[PDB]
């Protein structure tokens, strides 16, 4: 509720000091954009040199044991991602200490709708609801200067009836589904535009951000090109090459593609495994794979050429990239590929698409790595975290390339399995809602991380529906390893073919807490993402009867 | 021949201004190895197609009419670094190992003749070393014509003008710089793809320095041009080589 500036300046206030700082920034927490924030946040620090810590948090769960035990010296505090759906005011209580209150706790979360406890009553925010949802946004604000603090008889009753008149618009408030309005890092760049810093890999950090997302709608991400575009156009390295040079050498934008990891793969590898592409030409099907082929035929590619790595496939080829897709894509209905994107070359290394670099995060996540082995693994992520924060900077490319070698990998895993789900046709269409559960499958242990799951529901999701008429029918997964049958199912939402018309705010967030404050049966939200839960083998079934109904949507 | 000298220029340009941040790997490639007494260079493909794209794809087109090109543009490279004046230096072999896509044994059919093939295979037997030449003088039989011939790489007559004829020209073997040459076996791996049948063995030709780089029976993946030569056994039925540059085995192998 605040200037960006003025919030900035405020935590500047309160954090110099000596033995300083002391600020615990908290990174959080599976999110990509959460990295592409706090890198940048990160590196604003560094250039007042002041002091911080950062922390890997995974579960929300988790974070209460950190702040309830490790807290001394620290007037002021930041937190991403976190907050904006439960309330850390009772969630951490607080326990009002000292107005002009010790310790600003700053919340970045691009999650709507805000907690109602959160925005009014300021305590421990400093809200960072600025500026998506100002809004109004009259429905929170009638919420408490009505509620607070709130012949005699009919004034009794005209009360009441008031009240309750208030709590039925409220009750439709906070109640609803999680959906992201603009990307934190934006925000942080809009923020950081006002400090006055244009930097080159700042502004990547940006696109990386915007970026993170495209997988999961935009929603609003349509019209961030202008943001970011205009941003582009405000730098620039040089006015013409002057090939390379080899330094700046800088990003730049270049016809990019939905197809997966067209670079540093194979290109019929590259169409084979993209996510979009699986489903408009069902390659699943045998009978559809071939059409890709005959897409090859038409293109003049030939097959063994499109076998071979894209760094060494003929020039022509190269040349003719942004024209026979042109020529052809558009007879097979796949002529929303092409996206203006962005891209930067790193000169004699190669060059980078925006989208595959999230991939290779992404890659880095899960992989190139009762209660004490779930720890243990979270503990595992939590290692694995920084493995792939590393790769962010530019000074080593190194391993950045040991994410490439796994992203390819996942899909060939991912795309894999998901072909042996569509065998079994084991969609179950159900009456309300879609619904899919993996009772048994190879390597589960890829499948332990949510966002493996996120990205296995996406392209399952993506795949039923082209559409393909009726209905996007939100989708549900299961699987398990090990852990005693934690059987991790998340919550997904519907994929419109590039018209979207509406969010349509998934709905499986309230679904699940209707059932956890009815039976709870070994419900367990300890994931930070309220579409996510775990549930055991004895507790699904009777789980999934009442995840059937009563349907709220 | 003015474009052997554009070629050479950019590949003169692609040895001194090449930078990985921030030491030149090839520019140091080259002093670490001449001091050992070396005499090679390996280039790393992704760095060549990251520093010039036309490069590579005229290296990728007429291997064998342009890798000559490179050697004498690396060697003329060494004349200012190895030493300075104001002898004798031999013209490096150039070694490059790149990943591209494994082609394997049994899918070598014509059509890739003549363009750079990466493959899989375990050597059978090594054989015996055996001289090709490099630079030799020749003398004339009657009019004693002094000739030095520059022999390259990669058969070539020697020619009969200065009765006199039909071919008067001996060698001087007391002055002819002369290399090694290996002859490698491959046997295609036993995994893949023998099916039923007895699998196929092309044979090779190593040299300088890549000789008796490889005990016979490890795996390898050699790099190389593809490449045919005639060998009288009709017709016409010439019989297929690979040529390598260069060899890496697998891991490790020491």
């Known amino acids: 509720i605040s200037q960006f500036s003025e919030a900035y300046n405020k935590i500047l206030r309160n954090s110099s000091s000596h033995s300083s700082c002391q600020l615990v920034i908290f990174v959080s927490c599976l999110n990509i954009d959460a990295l592409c924030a706090t890198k940048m946040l990160s590196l604003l620090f560094k250039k007042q040199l002041v002091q911080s810590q950062i922390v890997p948090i995974f579960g929300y769960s988790e974070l209460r044991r950190h702040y309830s035990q490790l807290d001394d010296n620290i007037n002021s505090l930041l937190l991403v991602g976190f907050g904006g759906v439960i309330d850390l005011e009772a969630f951490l209580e607080i326990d009002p200490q000292e107005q002009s209150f010790r310790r600003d706790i700053y919340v970045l979360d691009a999650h709507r709708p805000w907690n109602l406890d959160n925005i009014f009553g300021s305590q421990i925010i400093q809200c960072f609801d600025d500026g998506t949802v100002d809004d109004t946004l009259g429905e929170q604000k009638e919420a408490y200067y009505k509620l607070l603090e709130l012949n005699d008889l009919s004034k009794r009753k005209q009360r009441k009836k008031q009240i309750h008149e208030y709590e039925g618009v409220l009750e439709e408030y906070y109640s609803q589904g999680t959906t992201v309005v603009n990307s934190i890092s934006a925000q942080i760049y809009s923020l950081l535009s006002a400090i006055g810093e244009t930097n080159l890999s700042n502004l990547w950090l940006n696109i990386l951000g915007t970026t993170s997302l495209d997988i999961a709608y935009a929603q609003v991400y349509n019209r961030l090109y202008p943001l970011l575009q205009d941003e582009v156009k405000r730098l620039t390295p040089s006015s013409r090459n002057s090939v390379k040079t080899p330094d700046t050498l800088t990003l730049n934008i270049q016809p990019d593609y939905y197809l997966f990891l067209l670079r540093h ?7 084979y495994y993209s996510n979009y592409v699986n489903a408009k030409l069902s390659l699943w099907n045998e009978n559809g794979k071939k059409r890709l082929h005959k897409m090859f035929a038409r293109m003049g590619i030939p097959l063994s050429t499109a076998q071979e790595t894209w760094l060494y496939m003929d020039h022509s080829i190269k040349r003719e990239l942004g024209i026979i897709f042109d020529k052809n894509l558009d007879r097979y209905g796949l002529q929303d590929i092409i996206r203006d994107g962005f891209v930067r070359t790193l000169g004699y290394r190669g060059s980078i698409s925006a989208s595959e670099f999230v ?5 880095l996540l899960e992989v190139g790595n009762s209660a004490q082995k779930l720890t243990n693994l979270r503990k595992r992520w939590v290692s694995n975290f920084w493995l792939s924060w590393d790769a962010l900077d530019d000074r080593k490319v190194e391993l950045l390339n040991r994410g490439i070698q796994l992203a390819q990998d996942l899909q060939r895993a991912i795309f894999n399995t998901g072909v042996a789900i569509l065998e079994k046709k084991l969609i179950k269409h159900l009456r309300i809602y879609r619904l899919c559960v993996l009772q048994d499958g190879p390597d589960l242990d ?17 795949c039923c529906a082209e559409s393909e008429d009726k209905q996007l029918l939100p989708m549900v997964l299961a699987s398990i390893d090990e852990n005693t049958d934690t059987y991790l199912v998340a919550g997904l939402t519907p994929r419109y073919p590039r018209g979207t018309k509406k969010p349509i705010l998934n709905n499986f967030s309230m679904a699940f807490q209707q059932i956890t404050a009815e039976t709870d049966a070994k419900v367990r939200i300890d994931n930070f993402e309220s579409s996510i839960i775990e549930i055991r083998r004895e507790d699904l079934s009777p789980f999934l009867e009442k995840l059937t109904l009563s349907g709220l949507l | 021949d003015d474009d052997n000298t554009e070629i050479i220029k950019s590949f003169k340009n692609f040895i001194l201004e090449f930078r990985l941040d921030s030491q030149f790997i090839y520019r140091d490639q080259l002093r670490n190895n001449i001091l050992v007494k070396n005499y090679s260079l390996t280039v790393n493909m992704e760095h060549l197609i990251g520093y010039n794209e036309d490069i590579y794809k005229k290296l990728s087109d007429e291997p064998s009419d342009i890798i000559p090109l490179f050697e004498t543009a690396i060697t003329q490279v060494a004349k200012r670094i190895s030493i300075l004046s104001r002898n004798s230096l031999p013209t490096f072999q150039l070694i490059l190992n790149s990943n591209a896509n494994q082609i394997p044994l049994r899918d070598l059919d014509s059509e890739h003749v003549s363009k750079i093939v990466r493959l899989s295979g375990i050597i059978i037997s090594t054989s015996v070393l055996s001289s090709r030449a490099t630079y030799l003088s020749i003398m004339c039989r009657n009019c004693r014509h002094t000739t030095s011939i520059t022999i390259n790489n990669f058969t070539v007559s020697l020619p009969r003008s200065c009765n006199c004829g039909p071919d008067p020209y001996i060698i001087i073997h007391e002055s002819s710089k002369f290399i090694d040459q290996q002859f490698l ?43 045919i030569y005639n060998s009288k056994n009709g017709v016409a039925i010439r019989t297929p080589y690979i040529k390598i540059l260069g060899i890496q085995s697998d891991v490790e192998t020491s």
Do not use: H
């Not at chain 1, 991939?359 to 890659?363: G, S, V």
């Not at chain 2, 046997?187 to 793809?193: C, F, G, K, S």
């Not at chain 2, 007895?198 to 030709?205: F, G, V």
């Open chain 1, 446 to 462: 890829l499948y332990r991380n949510p966002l493996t799951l996120l990205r296995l529901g996406n392209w399952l999701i993506e």
């Open chain 1, 359 to 363: 991939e290779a995060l992404t890659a």
């Open chain 2, 185 to 227: 076996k491959l046997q295609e791996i036993p995994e893949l793809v023998p099916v039923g049948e007895m699998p196929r063995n092309l044979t090779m030709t190593c040299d300088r320095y890549l000789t008796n780089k490889v005990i016979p029976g490890t795996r390898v993946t050699i790099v190389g041009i593809y490449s």
């Open chain 1, 265 to 271: 793969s194979s290109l019929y590898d590259s169409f």
